[model samples]
Target: ALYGFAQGLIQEAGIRIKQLMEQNLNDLVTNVDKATEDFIFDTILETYPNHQVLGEEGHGHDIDTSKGTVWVVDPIDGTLNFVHQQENFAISIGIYIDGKPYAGFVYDVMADVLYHAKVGEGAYRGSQPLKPLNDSNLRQSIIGINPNWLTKPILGEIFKEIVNDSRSARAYGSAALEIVSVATGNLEAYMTPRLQPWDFAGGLVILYEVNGQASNLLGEPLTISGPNSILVGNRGLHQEISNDYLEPHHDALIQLHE
Candidate 1:
């Protein structure tokens, strides 16, 4: 019921957004961009009643990490892409009670794909169940990264390590895509050194669906109620990256040692 309801609203917003984009060609608004999130937040609040809701558009409340169920939401990921370009955007939402993820949904509106998962239930791409992940080296894997990583000297140091060592790397401007890629095996691994909770909210749900290991660059557990500046890949590759890559230069680039 929640999935269908959320999908219906997101699809409607997606259709509306695509139409508007076709007409505008060059301009978009926070209101226009936030349309999808608005639909999801409002709909969920209406049905769930007292369920806590947090949205990028300013709809939820302060989250207390120690207790209660709270929804973390990013109305749109890749807002720049959604407004100016024609690719890489998504609607993300995650339900966490007492800091534990129960359900997650990352919807790529334009592409009409829903990556959904419930804890211990695995994950799905639309209706298709996802397979387990087993990506190894950075050179042999397709990785999703931030373009900024290549420019900054710190990230440059790390990415250069991968460029010299791994299969290939990529950056898709969307955190949700990067996370889902790990879940689906399309990308052997993924990493981003900085992100807000909402940025990975939905993606976290999907990534864990396939039992993927997602955490800080240091291989620590992620903080759901706040932001995390580091995120790494699935089990095998996650360890490889954290130990072989991040640990060596931990003090130079990262905010805190974990």
Candidate 2:
């Protein structure tokens, strides 16, 4: 019941996004971003008055996630995509019960493709079931990553071999979309040095349901409480990236130890 409710809310958010775009407002990105967040927050509050909210637009940035119900929402997950590309952006939300992930949703607003999951149940790609991840190794893996990272002095040096050794890498400009790409087996891994709870909250649940693994670079558990340097992949590949690549270079990468 809750899953369906959240799903409906995400679709509603998408429509709201389109409406914002149709109006041709100035500063469209910020206006649309904050407006959709307001719409989502208002709608959720009307239904679940007691629940807590954490929105990327600062709706409830300091809430405690380890108690009662919590909603981690990113009204627009890819702002630049919304403004320039108009297709890669998404609406993301995750429902947590007592700090435990209960439901997650990532909606590609323009495409109408939603990736979702309910705890203990399998994930879905727009009503079709997503299969369990196929175990893969780094050499054969196509990873999701922003290519800009490939140019940063420290990050570039640290990740040089991983990108060269892998099947290849692609960046979708949106963390949630890239994460679902991995869940759907289109990519074997996705990682970034820093992402807020809202950025990975929805996709994290969907990935886990497909037998994918998620954590910080060191393989530590991710928390709904704050931002993290995320690393995710199918089981074997996740371990390989952490142990073989990230661990050995921990000293250099620890500069981003957030």
Candidate 3:
């Protein structure tokens, strides 16, 4: 019942946004983004009033998530893509039970496709079940990473080494969608320096079922309560990159940023 309700709510919100796509890059809140969030928030509030909700649009930011269910929502994961391309954006929602992931959904609004997962039940892309990820080596892998990472002070230089070692890199702008690409084997890894909880919550659950791994750049467990530097990839590749690139230079990297 919970899964059904969430799936329906996300799809309905996607439809609402589609009808109201108003471009506004100068403003933080685009018309479609706000309307979509309000539609989903109101539905969730009406249906499950007691559940805590946190949204990119500030619907329930102060709700505690250490106990009970907490819904993390990003009405549109790639606002720039939504406003400029009218595509490449998604609606991401993750439900956490007592600060642990329970269920999640990432709806690709432009493509009319949905990616979702339940903790123990596996994951799906649209109606198709995803297969467990195949092992991929670092040198043979293609990663998803933004171009901005190529010029940063310390992290950039470290990532540049990884990029040079890998087959190549790609960046889709939307963290949720980039994670999906990793889950589907289109990309071996996706790394970003900063991401809010709503940006990764849904994709994290889906990736877990497909044998993909997600962690902070330091290879620590990611918590949903704060923004983080994320590195997600197939299991083997994840470990290799962390140990070879991130771990050895961990101290230097931290100092540069701080």
Candidate 2 residue-wise lDDT, 116-189, digit = tens: 99989999998899999888989999998898888888888777878888989888899988888889998999
**TM-score for all predictions?**
0.88, 0.96, 0.95
Question: Which stretches of candidate 2 lie above 4 Å from their native place?
Answer: none
For candidate 2, list the clashing residue pairs, or say none: none
Off by over 4 Å in 3: 22-29, 256-258
Candidate numbers, best lDDT first, in rank order: 2, 3, 1
Report each candidate's C-alpha RMSD, comma-separated, in the order given. Answer: 2.5, 1.3, 2.1
What is the lDDT of every predicted structure here? 0.74, 0.89, 0.88
**Which of the two, 1 or 2, has more lDDT?**
2
Query: Poorest 10 consecutive residues of model 3 by lDDT?
Result: 20-29
Tens digit per residue, CA lDDT, model 1, 58-110: 66556574477777778678887876666678878878877788888888877
Ordered by TM-score, highest first, the candidates read 2, 3, 1
